[PDB]
From a paper:
The recognition of antigenic peptide-MHC (pMHC) molecules by T-cell receptors (TCR) initiates the T-cell mediated immune response. TCRs are expressed as heterodimers of α/β or γ/δ chains in complex with three CD3 dimers (CD3εδ, CD3εγ, CD3ζζ) that are responsible for initiating downstream signaling. Here, we report cryoEM structures of two distinct full-length α/β TCR-CD3 complexes bound to their pMHC ligand, the cancer-testis antigen HLA-A2/MAGEA4 (230–239). We also determined cryoEM structures of pMHCs containing MAGEA4 (230–239) peptide and the closely related MAGEA8 (232–241) peptide in the absence of TCR, which provided a structural explanation for the MAGEA4 preference displayed by the TCRs.
The MAGEA4 (230–239) and MAGEA8 (232–241) peptides only differ by two conservative substitutions: a valine to leucine replacement at position 2 (V2L), which is buried, and a threonine to serine replacement at the moderately surface-exposed residue at position 9 (T9S). To further investigate the structural differences between these two peptide epitopes, we conducted cryoEM analysis of MAGEA4 and MAGEA8 pMHCs in the absence of TCR. 3.4 and 3.1 Å resolution reconstructions were obtained for MAGEA4 and MAGEA8 pMHCs, respectively. As expected from their conserved sequences, the structures of MAGEA4 and MAGEA8 peptides were highly similar. The most notable difference occurs at peptide residue D4. The D4 side chain projects down toward the HLA α2 helix in the MAGEA4 peptide, while it protrudes up, away from HLA groove in the MAGEA8 peptide, appearing to form a salt-bridge interaction with the R65 side chain at HLA-α1. The distinct D4 conformations can be attributed to the V/L substitution at position 2; the bulkier leucine side chain in MAGEA8 results in a slight remodeling of the peptide backbone that in turn favors the formation of the peptide D4/HLA R65 salt bridge. For PN45545, Y50 from CDR2β appears to make a cation-π interaction with R65, while in PN45428, E52 from CDR2β forms an electrostatic interaction with R65. These interactions may be compromised in the context of HLA-A2/MAGEA8, where the positive charge of R65 is neutralized by its interaction with peptide D4. Adoption of a MAGEA4-like peptide conformation by MAGEA8 would require disruption of the peptide D4-R65 salt bridge, which may be energetically unfavorable. Our structural analysis of MAGEA4 and MAGEA8 pMHCs showed how a conservative valine to leucine substitution at anchor residue position 2 can allosterically impact the conformation of solvent-exposed peptide residues contacted by TCR, thus affecting recognition.
Residue numbers in the entry:
A (entry chain C): 1 to 12
B (entry chain A): 1 to 224, 228 to 276
C (entry chain B): 1 to 99
The structure:
Amino acid sequence: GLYDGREHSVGC
Amino acid sequence: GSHSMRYFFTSVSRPGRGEPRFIAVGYVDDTQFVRFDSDAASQRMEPRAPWIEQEGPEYWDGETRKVKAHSQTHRVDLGTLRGCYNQSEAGSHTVQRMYGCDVGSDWRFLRGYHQYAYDGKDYIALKEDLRSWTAADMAAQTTKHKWEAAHVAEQLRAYLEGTCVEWLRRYLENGKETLQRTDAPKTHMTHHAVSDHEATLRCWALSFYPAEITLTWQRDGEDQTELVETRPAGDGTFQKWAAVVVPSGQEQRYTCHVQHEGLPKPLTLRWEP
Amino acid sequence: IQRTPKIQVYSRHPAENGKSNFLNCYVSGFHPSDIEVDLLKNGERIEKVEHSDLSFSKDWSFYLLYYTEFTPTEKDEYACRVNHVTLSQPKIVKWDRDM
């Protein structure tokens, strides 16, 4: 089972 | 014995030839059980194990949705990272990710990890206490502030302490005849002839599972020798060998010691010609 | 940044002339991911090779596995040609039965 919920990106 | 379940994601960029490639595999401790590929024609989270095909259709629908949600974030990570490094628009740069969770012999949470890389260099990671990050430059530090002002770790701890272990226990219960087995290695020792007054003993260990073994030579009691990586046999087993160069005439004084989880008592190997 | 692969060519079961078997070519430890691997018989290519998926180790270095089905014979020679970015020329590894 994968990870569900509010995937965040990288800021730079 | 302990058990684990990990996930590996990859996103290689391609400029001018379309969209970045995206491969995502999933492992129980040493057995791949699912995969995905952005170039195959299925566009679905395809099974790769016998004990996993017996799940319903909603499971596969959810898995496909989530693995497609991950790639849409990798594709933007690539662009942002290329932009904030003053790099060209013609090379191919790689982003990798990995996470999972461990359980003990009593099948309760033991450890959890979540990492992130860029061009093969560590970028950011979740510490052993699952509450603080580990930066590596000014870039990682700014990302750490952004992720720490959105409690990202709090959201990513519930999963690894709850649902990861729940899924791992469900999988371990279903595929019991495959995941909970230990195969004892089959060992033999050979002989070469490099010159007139030398030799090269070798200690083989074939077709064992899991992939954690140790081979050591001992010149009558003292440790020392070229080893090779544990290589996959292709059908869910593994192989390994270790060799020690030795002057000729002294061959009944060397021993090879084999230690595997599937072996109750340590095995000793001596030259019996 | 860039690492160079490590090649091993072996057979699944212990080789024996006349019995069906498999030929593996396990490359590991390279970076980046774009690699070209071929299994050769008598110097010519083989058309029906399959490979596993792109995984990586704890230090972010990839590894693959190419395999095909063959029948060993005392007259034929098998090999594995690999070509990476960090290699200035291809690398031909032969299959000696004891490794």
